């Protein structure tokens, strides 16, 4: 049954609640982004109204075959009326098409649902600046002070410099980047740009990237692997066995692989600077774990909430254990006492 933290009180609405069957009294299902834990349950047989971004609606139609008549895409940064209630979609700085949702309840309550997000000071100058928020439904993925990681820009600098060095030393090296969902496209696109290559991938992944409105995409990606020296593979295949196997397939065009696994946090983060990261190596194969996150660090999360000053916080992540829940509630109280709201 649908958990309370997926329901918007005072409305007919749910958020990211497609795996529960027909939810009683739900008149409109919102979807924040196209990640499987959130869309779980949608298919071509769904016949209720789904509200989402344009990019998310491209993916619903083309990848899951949801029929067009039930897809309701909304523009961002634009006041819209849905079943009698004003809503706004805001960029969540997550994966392509990911949104936060502002609901303006008929009784005067204002609710922000972050979906999945990476908080940024740029958010302090969106339509959030304009009014008070009573209830915050918060992506608390990394809600503990041990979770530190660098900016996306520092991580991409490291990856570009690493790839460019390796391939300039050895023009016969192949670069491989792991993927299992949309998101983190900057990693492989920035590497292919510095090398003057397109990124090669499977037809299924090419299809997915073509739904994303990325400018000049036809110039950057391809299904012709042989013409490319940056290849995308499933994240599961980014290991010595899986890579040795791929290298066989390229028919002696290449004699070395440099591979990237963009993880979020790993506890190498509590000890090592991005500058100091080193790969795991076996023979002519090296694998770098790089901490490219599309969720808030603890400090980014704290700064956002202390700026917003919500009356009540509802976590949407890490809610299954009492120890997690109690940890998170302690930090919420600290933040409120330090800031004074
Ligand atoms: Ni997500």
**Element-level helix/strand string:** EEEHEHEEEEEEHEHEHEEHEEEHEH
Number of domains: 2
Enumerate how many helices there are, as a single number. Answer: 8
The profile of the biggest β sheet is: 7 strands, mixed
Beta-strand content bin: 15-25%
CATH level 4 superfamily of the largest domain: Ribonuclease Z/Hydroxyacylglutathione hydrolase-like
Tally of strands: 18
Name of the CATH class of the largest domain: Alpha Beta
* Strand arrangement in the largest pleated sheet: 13-12-14-11-15-17-16
Helix content, binned percent: 25-40%
Query: What molecules are bound to this protein?
Result: nickel (II) ion
The CATH topology of the largest domain corresponds to Metallo-beta-lactamase, Chain A
Shape: globular
What is the terminal-to-terminal distance? 35 Å
Oligomer: monomer
Level-2 CATH architecture of the largest domain: 4-Layer Sandwich
- State the secondary-structure class: alpha/beta
What integer value in Å does the Rg equal?
A: 22 Å
PDB class: hydrolase
Keywords: SGC - Diamond I04-1 fragment screening, PanDDA, XChemExplorer, hydrolase
Assembly: monomeric
Entry title: PanDDA analysis group deposition -- Crystal Structure of DCLRE1A after initial refinement with no ligand modelled (structure 112)
